């Protein structure tokens, strides 16, 4: 008795192993992340979050990819040396285990994920996609 | 920051017992 859940929480590709994809998050108001590997990893992997602004040439296309600054919560013990938002998939994840994450503060209209340099080898086996929650219109 | 699993994969748990040790 499944419901059509394409009319609610529609997912979109973000990183298909070797290509980033800015997805529009304006109409939506909440969004998370699912990390799924197709093989085993070799070393720990890191992924950098970016965001785009509407390029003046057209309001419905992403502009450049500007960096996202991670905002600290309470009870924090460490900060990224630059303050920049980035997630990490730890080593020893078997490719039948999805992994969750979510940025607590949005900025821009298109979110994007890129393989942090020096870790793009495992990136191929990694696939990151995004789901959302709201329509608002 | 919160990670999951799909299959049980708890199949091999080979319990061993003390053989005739004398």
């Amino acid at each position: 008795m499944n419901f059509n859940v394409g009319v609610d929480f529609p997912s979109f590709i973000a990183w298909d192993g070797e290509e980033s994809f800015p997805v529009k998050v304006d109409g939506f108001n909440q969004f998370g992340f699912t990390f799924k590997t197709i093989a085993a990893l070799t070393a720990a992997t890191t992924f950098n979050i970016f965001y785009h602004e509407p390029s003046d040439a057209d309001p419905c296309v992403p502009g450049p990819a500007i960096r996202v600054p991670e905002v600290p919560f309470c009870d924090t013990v460490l900060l990224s040396e630059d303050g920049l938002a980035a997630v990490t998939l730890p080593e020893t994840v078997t490719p039948d285990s999805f992994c969750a994450g979510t940025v607590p503060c949005m900025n821009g209209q298109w979110i994007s994920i890129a393989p942090a340099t020096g870790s793009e080898t495992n990136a191929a086996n990694v696939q990151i996609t995004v789901t959302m929650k709201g329509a608002t219109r | 920051m919160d990670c999951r699993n799909l299959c049980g994969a708890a199949a091999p748990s080979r319990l061993v017992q003390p053989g005739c040790f004398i």
């Binding site: - | 017992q17 053989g19 005739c20 040790f21 004398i22």
Partner: protein, 34 residues
């Protein structure tokens, strides 16, 4: 919509075996030799 109905004439018996747990064996004894 004629519905059929059929039974056999002579029945055959049914045999089977009764295998039973084997000898007690040791899966490794302490005092032994190579």
């Amino acid at each position: 919509m004629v519905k059929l109905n059929c039974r056999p004439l002579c029945q055959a018996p049914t045999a089977s075996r009764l295998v039973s747990p084997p000898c007690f064996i040791c899966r490794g004894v302490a005092p032994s030799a190579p």
